[PDB]
Design a protein around this nucleic acid. Structure first.
Ligand SMILES: Nc1ncnc2c1ncn2[C@H]1C[C@H](O)[C@@H](COP(=O)(O)OP(=O)(O)OP(=O)(O)O)O1
Ligand SMILES: [Ca+2]
Ligand code: NA
Length: 430
DNA sequence: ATTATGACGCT
DNA sequence: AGCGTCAT
């Protein structure tokens, strides 16, 4: 009853760029705009691997992970942009730099949590309170929400997409209590008005379009964001949760896409998020552990407490390369040359990072994969990172891995290595 | 022969 | 510390 928390204490948004690497390439090369197009890395092996796909190309069935030669079978006029290659490896600098452009804009509106190269969570609780004071009980016009969907509406007693959207928006606004400054639904709505403003500023200042979700926590905001992509934003209210979750496959909720979600399904014999409500908190803790159990019990009711962490910069800076099949590194000289290639890219990114962000990394993590292991990483060792110098870092990386060499011969490397990875971590202010 | 990242939980 | 999970 009156003591039952409803998880309506915050307004949180998740903003995610549409087909991000594709938009970066389309901005740069206008010939790619408004066309079926994809971004690919490498090219020699089956035309390159696809990492991003424009919405026009998705209509033909083109997807991430697909080889470009295969994508062309579905979409013969597919256009391609290639990721930059430097020092013999893919270099993602252009996209990291485009990401900073977007993140700096978002940061004008509120504190953000950088969730990936093209996604940030925003805690808007404070900004909403403020805007509510300016409004002074004044109603919110649909004109302030020109790209917003209200999940679950319209409902109750036109056949076009935009007409539906407006009908739902109208029902939502018609029902709002604008007189109550602490109404969660009102707070969400003001949140959405602010996100429209953030999304317009992003598009104006960078050319990039995005989608967004607005709800009371990160998981719902993330789920909401995906409901109406591209170039749209979706509000998911606390009230919309029972119907939304009633047919929502468990794997769709962030963190349940893998083995834990599979076990929730198998152990409990259910399919949808809403079905979770029938288990006690202790039942769920008994199957999935204390932390997961509590999290599930609240989450299936639309409640989650994970904070938007104040962090705009990545916590680690890493460089990795696979050496598949026949290309696996089998000689000491090969291993040393590639460690250097990786180490040079890392030095370049670290030096830039130190000048930009007033910090220095203090630990170097080195990770390899050996031919045969099903696991992505086979071994991980750390050493001190005391100077930003590529030759030193590559020398140290070798030292910590060289005893992995099974070969009795000095010059040979066995088993051959199928992945090398260098990562700078443990930053300190400077 | 997906590849290149990046955050966080467990012991 | 080193490994695993989950994500983009
Ligand atoms: N598995 C991956 N391997 C390499 N790069 C990836 C991978 N997944 C995503 N990326 C890169 C390319 C994407 O443009 C960018 C953002 O990813 P993501 O948000 O999942 O898709 P997207 O932005 O391309 O399309 P969407 O409009 O569906 O969000 O990160
Ligand atoms: Ca995206
Ligand atoms: Na994303």
């Amino acid at each position: 009853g009156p003591h039952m928390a409803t998880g309506q204490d915050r307004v949180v948004a998740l903003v995610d760029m549409d087909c991000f690497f594709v938009q970066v390439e389309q901005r740069q090369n206008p010939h790619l705009r408004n066309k079926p197009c994809a971004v690919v890395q490498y090219k020699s092996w089956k035309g390159g691997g696809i990492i991003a796909v424009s919405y026009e190309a998705r209509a033909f069935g083109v997807t991430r992970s697909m080889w470009a030669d295969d994508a062309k079978k579905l979409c013969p006029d597919l256009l391609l942009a290639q990721v930059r290659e430097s020092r013999g490896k893919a270099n993602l600098t252009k996209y990291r730099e485009a990401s900073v452009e977007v993140m700096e804009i978002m940061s004008r509106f509120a504190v953000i949590e950088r969730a990936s190269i093209d996604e940030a969570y925003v805690d808007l609780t404070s900004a909403v309170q403020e805007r509510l004071q300016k409004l002074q009980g004044q109603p919110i016009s649909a004109d302030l929400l020109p790209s917003t969907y209200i999940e679950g509406l319209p409902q109750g007693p036109t056949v076009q997409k935009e007409g539906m959207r407006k009908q739902g928006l109208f029902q939502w606004l018609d029902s709002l209590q604008i007189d109550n400054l602490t109404s969660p639904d009102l707070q969400l709505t003001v949140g959405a008005v602010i996100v429209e403003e953030m999304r317009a500023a992003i598009e104006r200042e960078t050319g990039f379009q995005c989608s967004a979700g607005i709800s009371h926590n990160k998981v719902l905001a993330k789920l909401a964001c995906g409901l109406n992509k591209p170039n749209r934003q979706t509000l998911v209210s606390h009230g919309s949760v029972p119907q939304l979750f009633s047919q929502m496959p468990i794997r769709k909720i962030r963190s349940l896409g893998g083995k834990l979600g599979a076990s929730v399904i198998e152990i409990l014999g259910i399919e949808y998020m809403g079905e979770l409500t029938q288990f006690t908190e202790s039942q769920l803790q008994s199957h999935f552990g204390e932390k997961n159990g509590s999290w599930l019990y609240a989450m299936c009711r639309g409640i989650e407490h994970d904070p938007v962490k104040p962090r705009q910069l990545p916590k680690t800076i890493g460089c990795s390369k696979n050496f598949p099949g026949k290309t696996a590194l089998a000689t000491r000289e090969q291993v040393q040359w590639w460690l250097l290639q990786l180490a040079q890219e890392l030095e370049e990114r670290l030096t830039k990072d130190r000048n930009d962000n007033d910090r220095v990394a203090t630990q170097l993590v080195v990770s390899i994969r050996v031919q045969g292991d099903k696991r992505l990483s086979s071994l991980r060792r750390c050493c001190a990172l005391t100077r930003y110098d590529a030759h030193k870092m590559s020398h140290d990386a070798f030292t910590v891995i060289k005893n992995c060499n099974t070969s009795g011969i000095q010059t040979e490397w066995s088993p051959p290595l199928t992945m090398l990875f260098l990562c700078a971590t443990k930053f300190s202010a400077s």
